[PDB]
Design an enzyme around this catalytic site. Structure first.
Site, PDB file in Angstrom:
ATOM      1  N   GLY A  33       0.770  -1.230   0.000  1.00 21.42           N
ATOM      2  CA  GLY A  33       0.000   0.000   0.000  1.00 21.42           C
ATOM      3  C   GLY A  33       0.806   1.288   0.000  1.00 21.42           C
ATOM      4  O   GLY A  33       0.302   2.328   0.427  1.00 21.42           O
ATOM      5  N   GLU A  53       1.434  -9.823  -9.835  1.00 20.16           N
ATOM      6  CA  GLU A  53       0.193  -9.531  -9.117  1.00 20.16           C
ATOM      7  C   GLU A  53      -0.942  -9.061 -10.006  1.00 20.16           C
ATOM      8  O   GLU A  53      -2.029  -9.637 -10.000  1.00 20.16           O
ATOM      9  CB  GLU A  53       0.409  -8.446  -8.053  1.00 20.16           C
ATOM     10  CG  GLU A  53      -0.120  -8.790  -6.666  1.00 20.16           C
ATOM     11  CD  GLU A  53       0.904  -9.410  -5.749  1.00 20.16           C
ATOM     12  OE1 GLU A  53       2.018  -8.861  -5.641  1.00 20.16           O
ATOM     13  OE2 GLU A  53       0.590 -10.441  -5.122  1.00 20.16           O
ATOM     14  N   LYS A 101      21.551   2.250   1.020  1.00 25.51           N
ATOM     15  CA  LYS A 101      22.692   2.729   0.264  1.00 25.51           C
ATOM     16  C   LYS A 101      22.607   2.226  -1.174  1.00 25.51           C
ATOM     17  O   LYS A 101      21.965   1.215  -1.461  1.00 25.51           O
ATOM     18  CB  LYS A 101      24.019   2.354   0.924  1.00 25.51           C
ATOM     19  CG  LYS A 101      25.115   3.240   0.384  1.00 25.51           C
ATOM     20  CD  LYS A 101      26.328   3.295   1.260  1.00 25.51           C
ATOM     21  CE  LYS A 101      27.218   4.409   0.753  1.00 25.51           C
ATOM     22  NZ  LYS A 101      28.376   4.679   1.639  1.00 25.51           N
ATOM     23  N   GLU A 107      -8.517  27.935   8.961  1.00 26.55           N
ATOM     24  CA  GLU A 107      -9.292  28.112  10.184  1.00 26.55           C
ATOM     25  C   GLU A 107     -10.742  28.468   9.902  1.00 26.55           C
ATOM     26  O   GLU A 107     -11.521  27.640   9.431  1.00 26.55           O
ATOM     27  CB  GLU A 107      -8.673  29.197  11.067  1.00 26.55           C
TER      28      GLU A 107
END
Ligand SMILES: Nc1ncnc2c1ncn2[C@@H]1O[C@H](COP(=O)(O)OP(=O)(O)O)[C@@H](O)[C@H]1O
Ligand SMILES: Nc1ncnc2c1ncn2[C@@H]1O[C@H](COP(=O)(O)OP(=O)(O)O)[C@@H](O)[C@H]1O
Ligand SMILES: Nc1ncnc2c1ncn2[C@@H]1O[C@H](COP(=O)(O)OP(=O)(O)O)[C@@H](O)[C@H]1O
Ligand SMILES: Nc1ncnc2c1ncn2[C@@H]1O[C@H](COP(=O)(O)OP(=O)(O)O)[C@@H](O)[C@H]1O
Lengths: 413, 408, 413, 408
Positions: C32, C60, C202, C277
């Site tokens: 996911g 898949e 890495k 807000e």
């Protein structure tokens, strides 16, 4: 009830007289904590002090490399082994490894051990790394049984014996239960440092010390837990469990300790330096700002320096450095630099463990000590602390109290 | 008894003399932490400085791909192999894989090794990822025996050898050995710190613990060792102190109100003798005071010790007289303020040994009458210290490496 | 040493030039987190920009559903695939499943891949979900070997290749070690929110960026870490790295920003609204209390609003919203509402990560910005903050300092 | 591309348009968190609103017991089954259990499903607990294959389907799927909070994270969207403000000294226009002031969002003009004061969209001169704010949505 001495530097008093006798002692720890070393040093104490002849059994290591191991701490064995010292039973694996056409009873090894003993008069034998024997022979069944017959045989012979075996604090019984008294050596890693410590869970049917206590190594393994000015306006203000200079940054205590000791050199008592901060040129150009003569104060045979950065070393190893410094040169009066650095970067139970240690050692070897530290003490610790100290404002150290009375209570009113 | 140098930047002193000799030392870390690098560079260090030929055994990596690796560091190995010095032993699995019809005596590999050494007279051997054979051969039985006879055979030959194996765990069936370095890569908060821990060298002087490191051309590590004062000048009042050439100054004050940047004449003196936070926008802001920047030229993005080493080699590159560090507070955070930075002591120590002059900026927390001095709190070790801030308010704190007027 | 560009929005500069070439790159993450998506976008960048033909191998997923997948972000492939675009090798499982009468060598697949390549001129190929191949064939032995022969073959052909594979931070190597450079995409869940981030452990034998850095998705995957008034008594008090209004609740900064921007509209420079807000009716009835004309201030083509509740969205997605807002409409001068809400509910290293991000972007695109926030800043963060501000007592904002000098130091004395 | 509604209360918007279409979506949670409920109610939503017939496959539950389940919600399914609309497929294990003599091709179930759909033309299918077959059949091998061919067959048929599977873990051998919701039941402190997390929908617009929920007739969830002022009156001084009808007031003060309850005339006005902490004992205490309660009628026990939704449907039931919340401090604690309640913003937002008037009581911490305003601290978003408390001391804080006298 029985008991036997070891005299490993500071272990015996926890065992209140050392290891059990005629009983099997198992020693376990994670790889890299000096189990084998503990065995070596144990038996070497035995033969050197008690002439209690020894057998060192080795599965992991090769003799030549165990002698080259032990020779690091200044112990020369094989030439002295010619005296009839300790005997190293070689149980190092055949490199070619071995093949199996059936199961084995390890009678060869145990009988070899007991001939070795009955030849060497030995009363003490150590055994390095049984888990290797479990990882030597891939049959985890029998080795239990025959290690058991070994340990039992040793209990019969009444000899003192030691076993070494390989996550520290958590589920730790390794894989070899089968023994009758157990020492667990763990070194824990916290933050980004290393604390080597010894735990004794219990010694069965015998006095044992309650809990786990940190240790370090020297020539032999050490720890010892359990115990139990002159110049300036000097005494005008004042009227030994060591002095404390607790002060805001730039505590200038540097003054007070510098000529605290300088007078010491004047009167002839022995002084020493123990500083963990400034490069000691600046230490005595901050002192050569006073007009004193430190490099001239040390015609050797009087003081010693070589500073040491706190973070570069673990705390109780510093404790040992000065322990055998003050032991090597026996100062009358010394001072300690920047407790502040040791006050942080460290869980304060470690730092106070430490400060109780040093304070205790100095207070009753009747050596006089000073201690400087800088505040932001806010580590709050009270007790055994003795003596503490229009526009702009200058510095003004003054005292609360000392001993049980006298001095100045009020500051520079 | 005995030990052998590595001369890799800053490891040798952690081991108190480098790797052990005549004994096989195991090097282990989680995958992706540059163990292979430590091995390669080990043998290259051996061969380049000592002309001590090396045998590099590789399973995981491909030989040509190990050289295309190394060309990043600017080193030609194929020239070194033709020089008859280093040999990269290919023990990489045949991609075609293996089929099995019975048990093995793994003599072939070891005999190959000892022929290689006894031909090249080699005194250094690396072995990258014994674990690969475990990811090759499904028999955890015999490999015990053949690793032991390998390491032992090498000790007969007496050559120094290294074994690499695949967070804070153990050794994943690699069997105990006789001296062990575990280099660990840590993940903390939301950044990652590479550190080297050295677990044990048996029968030998050794350093305590885990120690942070970064990479350059070769691995770099951070150990632990160790006109009467030409300075700025500043008009009106001209240094009540001055700040000694071997000193460092501390200006601690609320906010970065030090935009004035006292470093202006700290540098002006530098240029005076001739010796040498957008720093672009701050330098049209610096030309607001009347200094001559256009004529003066005749953080989260990097880890802390990357700042430390980068500046290590700037100051190594250009030999500054006096320079300053901007907004150290910023380097104190982005890390969360309880994560205590030793760091500043390190560089401070460094300042002590090469007569390099440093200044340090930092912003303090609240405002008036804070008995608290500095946020995570910088105390001693700082030579010269000072305050800052009804108006702005300069004051001196406390020193007696000299004496003067206690300000305001 | 070799390297290849990708130009995924902001990934390449961490890899300092993109992926290795002729080498196998493995990408792993919990289910996911857009691994498959990373592969798709990678190769689509390749073929669209570089005309670096591609092969998308899928175990898949079903093609029809991968195209209907990718078509979500506005990429139409099959019609363009007729151009000789990318080729999707169908390795979706036979639904009927399969029976076994012996072991297999997956030569069919790899050889199929290489014909596909040598037909499509491809230099880039991605491969989706190898763990599925381990959960396709229940023989965990061989698939290791033949995935290895695949990756090795690709290294021979010198093509850039990608592999996707399936607890995030902890023991994560999945089950398929076998590769030569590794990207790990983890999304962590803390408190009750989700942070999608990329770690590169890495890249072997090549420059790589140090550490892990958060990301989000748009049309293609994005993140970019690494950088490097007018009215009122206005300037009387003052004499850009953005302004700060830090104040006690009811900071009324609303005034200062409202006509900070309103004058902006007056003079003709472009302004924008970014408020998190109050419902913007009350935003401009609190502004229509001033007598100004906001709904009349916006004859469109001048400002834009649509407010957004802070908690309803993750922080750096807000960062992207305004990133491509300010990118779409290029304001001269804008202001940001209630940093306070973002100041709590969030680990303050996230909030300050964020504020350094936005401040950095605004300061040097030479866009002028304002920022309001309410105190109980007590988040303590100093630095790059520029301008800050008988019985009863009224509000009195005044400044410390700005730039490098001038303004009023003293308040409203 | 494409997606299909659920019209279950507050889920549809979390998925940014409901469940995906033509694809099988997996629903997973620990046992006892109402997954089965989500499935049942899903198909019932489909069929009741859209007349989109459904097939409900059930292993764990018993059909008749699923209807005796549903009658709790007041829904008759058997009438719906005879309506020829929904079919509850019984795939419950025969209690007599199973004996096994070989491997299976699980065609029977799937063919049963597709016959059921192609007969009922059904466009919705739920599948409750595939895990049950795992607790039935000990072969984790084949069920892989047959689940895959099931879900795929369903996608041929293109119907929307749901799979249920059995704290913060993974999927317990359920195999990856192509879109996944994980609804988790959390245990914190000494209470339990049901939340829905939606992990992924591939190739589709989606909402970020975990979101708290509770149950009613159907599952309820909490998303996130979005005389000039008739008020109380209060004698002596009559509102210096008044508090706008679309506003909210804040009275923050030490202790519940607000027993006076300003709400008294906040309500008196309500009744004036005719529009509509033991609250019994407080209302013989309210008759101490002279108001007319007997004539006025012509916390730990519930989870926070149960308070939120219960009051949601009180205010939905009776259309209040103006009401107030008693001792919000009490709702702030019993939860331990660091557990920060978003909550109050939610309801606040709600107040904004239906012209409902609210007042809010809360008790503050210590006493004099606290620069700290409120305990866990309520800041902005609050329209009207005020202080409280040598005598008691009223004062106004700070507003400029209006202006007036700054008190005392
Ligand atoms: N001079 C020294 N200073 C400090 N530690 C030493 C010194 N010489 C040997 N040691 C320590 O002795 C230890 C050997 O014991 P250990 O590693 O536990 O091996 P074993 O398991 O065989 O006992 C090493 O870890 C090493 O750190
Ligand atoms: N430009 C570079 N910067 C840093 N390190 C590099 C660079 N180029 C090559 N390397 C090194 O090459 C090493 C290859 O070794 P590697 O196999 O990654 O070790 P590990 O087994 O821990 O994964 C890398 O670890 C890396 O440290
Ligand atoms: N419009 C969109 N907005 C946000 N996220 C999206 C959008 N479209 C697709 N996604 C994301 O893409 C992801 C697909 O990748 P993932 O779930 O990891 O599948 P895979 O493992 O096959 O890559 C989904 O998690 C989904 O959240
Ligand atoms: N009065 C009620 N209040 C709340 N939920 C109810 C009520 N009656 C029935 N239900 C629901 O019926 C559901 C049966 O599904 P269940 O099997 O418990 O799901 P799970 O598989 O998570 O245990 C319960 O989870 C419950 O949510």
């Amino acid at each position: 009830v029985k008991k036997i001495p070891t005299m490993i530097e500071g272990f015996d008093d926890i065992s209140h007289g050392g290891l059990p006798q005629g009983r099997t002692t198992l020693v376990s720890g994670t790889s890299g904590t000096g189990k084998t070393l503990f065995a070596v040093q144990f038996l070497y104490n035995g033969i050197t002090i008690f002439n209690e002849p020894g057998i060192f059994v080795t599965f992991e290591e090769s003799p030549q490399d165990i002698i080259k191991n032990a020779l690091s701490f200044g112990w020369n064995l094989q030439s002295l082994i010619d005296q009839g010292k300790l005997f190293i039973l070689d149980a190092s694996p055949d490199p070619d490894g071995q093949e199996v056409a059936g199961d084995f009873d390890l009678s060869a090894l145990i009988e070899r051990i007991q001939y070795a003993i009955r030849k060497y008069k030995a009363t003490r034998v150590s055994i390095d790394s049984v888990t290797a024997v479990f990882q030597q022979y891939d049959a985890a069944s029998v080795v239990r049984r025959e290690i058991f017959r070994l340990a039992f045989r040793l209990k019969q012979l009444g000899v003192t014996t030691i076993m070494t075996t390989e996550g520290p604090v958590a589920r730790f019984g390794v894989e070899e239960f089968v023994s009758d008294n157990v020492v667990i050596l763990r070194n824990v890693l916290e933050g980004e440092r290393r604390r080597r410590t010894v735990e004794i869970l219990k010694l069965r049917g015998t006095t044992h010390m309650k809990g786990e206590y940190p240790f370090t190594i020297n020539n032999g393994i050490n720890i010892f837990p359990l115990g139990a000015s002159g110049v300036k306006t000097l005494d005008e203000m004042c009227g030994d469990s060591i002095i404390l200079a607790t002060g805001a940054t730039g505590t200038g205590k540097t003054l007070l300790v510098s000529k605290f000791l300088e007078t010491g050199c004047q009167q002839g008592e022995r002084a020493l330096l123990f500083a963990y901060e400034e490069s000691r040129a600046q230490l005595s150009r901050n002192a050569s700002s006073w007009g004193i003569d430190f490099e001239e104060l040390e015609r050797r045979g009087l003081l010693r320096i070589i500073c040491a950065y706190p973070e570069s070393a673990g705390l109780e190893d510093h404790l040992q450095i000065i322990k055998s410094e003050i032991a090597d040169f026996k100062p009358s009066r010394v001072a300690i630099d920047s407790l502040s650095a040791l006050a942080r970067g460290v869980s304060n139970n470690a730092f106070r463990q430490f400060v109780i240690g040093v304070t205790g050692f100095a207070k009753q070897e009747e050596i006089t000590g000073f201690f400087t530290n800088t505040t932001d003490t806010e580590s709050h610790i009270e007790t055994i602390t003795d003596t503490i100290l229009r526009g702009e404002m200058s510095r003004a150290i003054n005292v609360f109290k000392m001993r049980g009375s006298w001095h100045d209570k009020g500051i520079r009113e």
